Design a protein around this ligand. Structure first.
Ligand code: NI
Length: 341
């Protein structure tokens, strides 16, 4: 049965609630973005209206085969009426197509559901600045102060310079980047760009990237592995076994692999700086884990909430334990007392 934090009171709306069968009273199912924990339950046999971004809609049609008549894409930054309720989709600074949703309730309550997001000061000059928000359904993934990580810009700088250096030393080195869902495309596109190559990948992954409205994408990616010196592989294949087996398949074109594993946060973040990160190495294979996050750090989350000053906060992540729930409520109270709302 659908949990309360996926229901929008005063509406027939749910968010990211596709795995509970038919939700009693729900006239429209919103999908924030195309990640499996969020879309879980959707398939080509789903027969209720889905509201989402254009990019999320392209992926529902082409990857899950949801029929077109049930896909309702909405433009961003635009006031739209859905079943008699005004809504706005805003960019969530998560993966492609990911949105936050503002719901303007008939009784005058305003609700922001962040979906999955990485809070940014630029959101303080979106349509959010224009009115008050009473309830906030918040992505609390990293809501604890030990969760620090660098900016996306710094991480990409590290990766570009690492890759460029390795391949200029050895023109016979192959770069491999791990992937399992959309998001974090910047990692492999920046590296390929600095090396003057397209990114090579499977037909299934190429299809996925073709849904994302990335400008000039046809110039950046290919299914011809032979012509490319940046390859994508499934994340599970980024280990010494998987990589050796992949190097065998390239037919003596390369004698070295440098591989990147974009992770979320990892405990090495409490000690080590990004400058200082080193790979794991076995023979002619090196593997960097890099902390490229598409979720708020603690400090980014704190800033956004203190700026927004919501009257009530409802967490959407880490809700399954009493210890987590209790930890989160403590930080919300701190933030509220520090800022005076
Ligand atoms: Ni996500």
């Amino acid at each position: 049965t659908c949990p309360f934090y996926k229901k929008i009171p005063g509406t027939g709306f749910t968010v990211d609630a596709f795995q509970y069968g038919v939700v009693e009273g729900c006239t429209a199912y919103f999908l924030t973005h195309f990640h499996s924990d969020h879309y879980a339950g959707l398939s080509k046999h789903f027969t209720f209206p889905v509201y989402c971004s254009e990019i999320t809609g392209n992926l529902l049609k082409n990857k899950l085969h949801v029929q077109e008549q049930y896909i309702h894409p909405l433009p961003l930054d635009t006031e739209c009426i859905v079943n008699g309720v005004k809504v706005v989709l805003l960019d969530a600074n998560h993966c492609p197509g990911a949105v936050m949703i503002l719901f303007y309730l008939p009784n005058g309550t305003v609700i922001l559901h962040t979906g999955d997001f990485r809070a940014d000061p630029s959101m303080e000059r979106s349509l959010l600045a224009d009115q008050k928000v009473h309830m906030l359904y918040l992505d609390t993934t990293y809501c604890s102060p030990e969760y620090t990580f660098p900016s996306q810009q710094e991480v990409i700088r590290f990766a570009i310079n690492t890759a460029f250096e390795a391949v200029t030393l050895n023109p016979h080195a192959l770069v491999v980047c791990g992937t399992y869902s959309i998001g974090k495309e910047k990692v492999f596109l920046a590296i390929a760009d600095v090396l003057g190559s397209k990114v090579g990948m499977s037909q299934e992954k190429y299809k996925t990237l073709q849904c994302l409205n990335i400008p000039e994408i046809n110039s950046l990616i290919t299914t011809d592995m032979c012509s490319s010196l940046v390859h994508l592989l499934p994340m599970m294949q980024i280990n010494f076994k998987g990589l050796q087996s992949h190097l065998k398949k390239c037919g003596g074109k390369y004698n070295q692999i440098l591989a990147f594993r974009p992770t979320g946060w990892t405990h090495s973040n409490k000690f080590t700086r990004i400058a200082d990160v080193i790979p794991q190495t076995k023979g002619n294979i090196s593997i960097y884990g890099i902390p490229y996050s598409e979720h708020s750090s603690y400090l980014e989350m704190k800033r956004f909430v203190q700026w927004l000053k919501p009257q009530k906060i409802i967490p959407t992540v880490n809700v399954g334990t009493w210890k987590s729930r209790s930890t989160m409520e403590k930080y919300f109270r701190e933030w509220k007392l520090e800022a005076g709302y």
